[PDB]
Amino acid sequence: LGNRRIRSVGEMAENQFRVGLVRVERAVKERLSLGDLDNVMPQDLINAKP
DNA sequence: TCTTAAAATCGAAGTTAATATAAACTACATAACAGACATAAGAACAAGTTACAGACGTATTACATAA
Secondary structure (H helix, E strand, O other), rough: OOOOOOOOOHHHHHHHHHHHHHHHHHHHHHHOOOOOOOOOOOOOOOOOOO
């Protein structure tokens, strides 16, 4: 049992949230690379639905 | 003749009922929807054509009455 671990609701919630965050981060990096960022707000860059 | 990667299999019922991310403008042709008209089909009324029924009228026979 020192070689097997317990993973609870907090850990897997964190894991899935991090997966969604990476999913957002890919598109955010794609958008930031364009350059035209004069009229962009932080709420116009991320994607809450993933 | 000996490794080494693939290929295939692994009990019945029973229950069970799904998800959820990520160009715009313009030009043209076609299909669909609505309205109106004509047509075909049925409903209604009235008449005509025809035979039979229902009770009457007639014809026939038998009884009664008159000579």
